[PDB]
Design a protein around this ligand. Sequence first.
Ligand SMILES: NC(=O)c1ccc[n+]([C@@H]2O[C@H](COP(=O)([O-])OP(=O)(O)OC[C@H]3O[C@@H](n4cnc5c(N)ncnc54)[C@H](OP(=O)(O)O)[C@@H]3O)[C@@H](O)[C@H]2O)c1
Lengths: 159, 193, 48, 79
Amino acid sequence: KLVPTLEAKRDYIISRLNADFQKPWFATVNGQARDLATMTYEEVAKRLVELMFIRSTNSWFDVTWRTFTGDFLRRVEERFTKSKTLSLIQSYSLLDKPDEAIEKVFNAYPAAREQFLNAQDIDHFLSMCQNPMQKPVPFVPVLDRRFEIFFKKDSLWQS
Amino acid sequence: PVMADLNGGLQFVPELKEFTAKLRKELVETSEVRKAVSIETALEHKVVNGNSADAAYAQVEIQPRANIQLDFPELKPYKQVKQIAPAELEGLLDLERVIVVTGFAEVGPWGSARTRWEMEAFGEFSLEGCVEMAWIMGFISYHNGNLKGRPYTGWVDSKTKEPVDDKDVKAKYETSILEHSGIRLIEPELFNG
Amino acid sequence: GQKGGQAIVVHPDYLYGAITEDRYNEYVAKVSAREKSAYKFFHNGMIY
Amino acid sequence: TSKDIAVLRSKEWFQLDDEDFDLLNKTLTFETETEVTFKNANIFSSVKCFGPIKVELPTKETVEIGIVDYEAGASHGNP
Ligand SMILES: NC(=O)c1ccc[n+]([C@@H]2O[C@H](COP(=O)([O-])OP(=O)(O)OC[C@H]3O[C@@H](n4cnc5c(N)ncnc54)[C@H](OP(=O)(O)O)[C@@H]3O)[C@@H](O)[C@H]2O)c1
């Protein structure tokens, strides 16, 4: 009954996750919500920085999350590029000025500003959210048979 | 009968055999010594400085992935199209009465209508055409989760289930995809004997 | 059986010359959204 | 071969008395004695390498030709 009750309360529980919880519903653009497959690559990036990069310290919260965000731009370019080229991100250390490491890629493939995620770039994004040996992601990416793990894993340091 | 010596004068350069055999015997020396000297100095550079910092110079180079498309018609802005049609056309047609194709598809000897227009217009398959003809011929499958423990997410063999990238699919399959598509000697097991 | 048949197709862009502007770019935004959604659905199904 | 006698003097620490020495079909031995000064567990600070180069005579009695002469700071091994 888990997946179905999550089906009926979907619009509801994500409103609450956005309103009153630590790890918000990830797929939320400009206040209005959506799913991972409704969010464009550019939005995925511009949100990953909103939740994994600290503007006040101007520093990533972890090298693990910066590695996450980098391995994501890796496929972003792996998809939209036509032939084999050199990475626009050669060491993720470039992400230390993020809003420009974004433009650097999303000017090399302006298409990823308009087209949603390819579906193989969703389950990858998820297998990167449940990768061991990395700090769990500070948001909720999806509702499925692992929802509470996503919901209350490593939920102490936040204080 | 005429002879027509279209020879540049190669009957004059004397003892041409080894004069030739020397010119190339030198081009292998000057080639191979700069093969051997170059690799060891690059190898010298790896023991005084170590490859721990020399690996950051090995740049990361990305393989394109297959991103199929739907080929929707592009819509140029309104000023462009109000120009191509006669200016008097607007307000002049009962649009309820203008038929218009809105979708289309196909199942031919070349797969869908996207992967026949390739061997039709372009004579050969793209990457997005070779992955689709790989998927609709049951060569490659999908997989996400954990195979070999490691999380694999992407195309895989379908017979051996062993991971395969969309950059090594055109090399690995394009031979058979084209071997078994289009007008062919009739394969009996497609027609139950 | 002597069934012939000849159908001709015109280029779609001659159509939009027959509609008012605000309606066109209204339709334009409308397709833009459907295209993305169709992209999404085509890839989920193709995968699974 | 003849292309190794090139890669040899292609090197800076390989020097002889007469670089014109006929190096083909000869047999070169390297009785070298190296020094090293550390600055970390692995990052050297100063490496020296020296020791005569000898050649097999037709009597196979080794006779010196030149001297290995290497020195490098901040190495990571010995080339
Ligand atoms: N008795 C009490 O009153 C009390 C009170 C509070 C907490 N606790 C206990 O103390 C623990 C505190 O941890 P938690 O609950 O905050 O964590 P958690 O939500 O239980 O999740 C921890 C898991 O995430 C992974 N992980 C966490 N940080 C990581 C990092 N920096 N790098 C790589 N992987 C990381 C770990 O994987 P690995 O398997 O790779 O490590 C670990 O299995 C709890 O598990 C709880 O049982 C007890």
